[PDB]
Design a protein around this ligand. Structure first.
Ligand SMILES: C[S@@+](CC[C@H](N)C(=O)[O-])C[C@H]1O[C@@H](n2cnc3c(N)ncnc32)[C@H](O)[C@@H]1O
Ligand SMILES: C[S@@+](CC[C@H](N)C(=O)[O-])C[C@H]1O[C@@H](n2cnc3c(N)ncnc32)[C@H](O)[C@@H]1O
Ligand SMILES: C[S@@+](CC[C@H](N)C(=O)[O-])C[C@H]1O[C@@H](n2cnc3c(N)ncnc32)[C@H](O)[C@@H]1O
Ligand SMILES: C[S@@+](CC[C@H](N)C(=O)[O-])C[C@H]1O[C@@H](n2cnc3c(N)ncnc32)[C@H](O)[C@@H]1O
Lengths: 233, 241, 233, 233
């Protein structure tokens, strides 16, 4: 019934711009409904944040045991949802899991190979490891003009890291989405309103943004990476 | 364009996956419905669907949108065998290029059916005259590389419009384009026989003689993952200008 | 309040002969003459419900100038009686053509399940001052067959039509009914006529029970057509 | 296998309400008598004779639908001019008939006759075997309101007088019907203006007298036409 495929998409659109991060969770949840069965028993979410993915998880899947992880419990049955709080690279994973899901969080990790060792041991055989992260061009306009940002993995780094850690890969995709704001100030407004973020430096930042001024506006790039994976066989 | 808190966007995607080859049409009607949830209001009084067919898109339309009056169109009258009679659903059976469109429509929707139209610019004129001001035109269709494997090996297919032929025809018909995209999917089957079985199982479709050389001809499309079959869906969310 | 039309009541009765096989056509001729009285000779858009073989259809085109003629019936197999625009299907489940000058129907509305709300679509599809003119059948139609076999249809009467037409927003310019009894030579001739017009001991009993419908001229068979000429107000 | 052309006996009754142009009443009686002629008579007729043609409203309907080879018109006066159109002017009860007729036709004229039984003797001898005698006249309820409010009016035959007289003269009756029509004018003056437009001190009481005929829809004027399709033996 299943058939391997390669795909490539492109188009021009309009976005509410304040919605960008929740729609990434919506796209990841579509991939979960595709591959994973409706019913699962034990699930572990890393970096749950405000809970945009968790509410999509519970309303689309039937899970009995749910473990939520983040540095803070800002998500506001109940004995079925338990709280593991702290840096996930410091904590011991819940065991015998059907699925580990993460959304927009793995880019903050310092030692991903070691963390994927914890993913392997905690998961059952053919247990699901599904996550969304970001590639090297995510918010690269801010990286060039301010010298700040994360060093991201690309698709080949993830591929050779999951295979070397003993994971079979079912889905591995990436996307580059350029938003075009009217002026460089609206770019900063979007970053504050979505929570990502001298007077000399401010307008000097607005001067150099002309290097990113296209016919439609000043560009801001999001580079989400999507992956669906299974353990061992 | 001059509207605030909406931002223009350009995107590109690529990846490798495992699909259920029989679910392709459901995948496209699901993708189009996901676009309808983004751009369109949750309630619509009058909606018109061209080429309802089995009803894959119709199922997704009624569960996500409160519709007061739903009008369904298709070529065959026995399309009404795949549906149960409801008071708020009317029918317009026949070739849609020969039928008067229902009046005062909030949205005209159609999934993987406009590629069978003979006169597309004349149909877009009817869409414009049937929609309310700022009425919705949202459709799925197919691009030029659609099933190019079957076009080359059998010499049969369709004439497909590309994005900027659509972009040009919609703008001059009076439509503003809010969303316009396309994707290319190559499915890798294990053998050319699975390609033919897939084409008949999903309802797209000589013997042993020509059936054997067609298998050897398909060797030109064999990747390391299997034998390719290309799908080229086109999506478009438009509004009456 | 028109200064040339005048309110009218009439009643007629008499004895005659009839070619028993042309009843359906004769019913159409009576409706066609009522159309000639009230209606303009030119109408751009006309919608005919239940055209059938086209008895009333050809009488419409012969005496009126129509630009858009839409013909409806249940079965597409009646287009083989013509050659217009075609609207095949159950009229109660069909999207009406809009901005109509007249909606015509001959001996077909007695088959409808929900007449009050089909009139609502007759109201919306018609222009201001649009015409609604039809012939149907009354409660005593084929009552000899319903009394003997228990089979038949529930027919509205005039007062039901006068009530539902004004409740839906229609004026009434003509509302009449006729009862006609044809006296066949024998009950066998009644069955022969019923199958020619397209409508062992159970058979002999039927011939016996029909003697209760014996008159001086023959055996009875009642037709009860209703004629109406309405207009949207 | 075989065609179907079986005449059957029939008794009918009609009733309803309507609107109509008051100036159009004789033209409609002519239109109704022409409908009966089309239902009983062949399209081809060699010799036709009309009694009381008058304005010619029935004559235009006759030649419109039937193929006549010789047409003789009769009336007290004379209102195409082909060579096969003859005129017989004068009191028809003092004139010898044209012989070997296929049909004798008359519209709204036989009510003025002084000796109908004698005139039926002439109709018999002039008609061929199975030759048609068709006419429209009026019954005793015709203009009954003007009859009692002025004490003036003609003496009319009823249906039984005609049925007995035709059978006595040697005629067979294939159709015999009567109709009562009550027109409702806004006021008795419009009744008089109708009586003066259609060729038919003490005034205020004649209006006061007319209140005896006041319905809810207006003041009544009654027409009582009689139709009969006969053929000679
Ligand atoms: C961009 S938010 C994601 C919010 C959204 N609900 C989702 O899941 O996609 C990423 C979250 O990961 C959390 N996070 C980052 N590093 C972490 C770590 N080392 N251990 C646990 N949580 C971490 C942060 O607190 C942040 O809330
Ligand atoms: C691929 S099917 C789409 C079925 C289903 N709605 C879906 O997309 O999953 C395309 C449909 O378009 C209809 N169609 C083709 N030509 C048409 C025409 N000229 N007018 C109306 N419908 C047409 C066909 O009947 C066929 O069922
Ligand atoms: C007695 S025939 C009339 C035929 C004749 N040509 C005429 O119109 O006077 C009635 C017709 O109505 C059609 N009919 C019955 N129910 C219908 C419905 N619900 N919707 C549309 N047509 C219907 C039937 O197919 C049938 O041909
Ligand atoms: C009231 S008109 C009806 C005319 C109408 N156009 C029609 O024929 O249907 C009857 C006609 O009969 C004529 N008529 C009356 N008495 C007649 C008589 N004795 N001989 C010949 N014509 C007579 C009158 O002159 C009158 O024109």
């Amino acid at each position: 019934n299943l058939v391997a495929q390669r795909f490539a998409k492109a188009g021009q659109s309009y976005s509410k711009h304040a919605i960008v991060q929740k729609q990434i969770c919506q796209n990841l949840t579509n991939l979960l409904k595709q591959f994973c069965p409706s019913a699962m028993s034990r699930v572990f979410e890393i970096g749950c944040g405000s809970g945009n993915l968790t509410r999509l998880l519970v309303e689309s899947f039937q899970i009995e045991n749910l473990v939520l992880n983040d540095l803070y419990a800002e998500v506001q049955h109940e004995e079925h949802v338990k709280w593991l709080i702290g840096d996930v690279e410091t904590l011991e994973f819940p065991q015998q899991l059907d699925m580990i899901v993460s959304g927009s969080a793995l880019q903050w990790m310092q030692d991903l190979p070691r963390l994927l060792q914890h993913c392997y041991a905690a998961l059952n055989e053919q247990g699901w490891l599904c996550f969304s992260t970001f590639g090297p061009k995510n918010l690269i306009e801010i990286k060039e003009l301010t010298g700040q940002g994360l060093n991201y993995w690309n698709l080949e780094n993830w591929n050779s890291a999951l295979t070397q850690a003993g994971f079979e890969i079912l889905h591995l995709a990436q996307s580059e989405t350029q938003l075009y704001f009217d002026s460089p100030k609206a770019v900063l407004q979007h970053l504050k309103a979505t929570g990502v973020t001298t007077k000399q430096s401010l307008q000097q930042f607005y001067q150099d943004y002309d290097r990113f001024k296209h016919t439609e506006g000043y560009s801001l790039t999001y580079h989400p990476i999507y992956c669906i994976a299974r353990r061992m066989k």
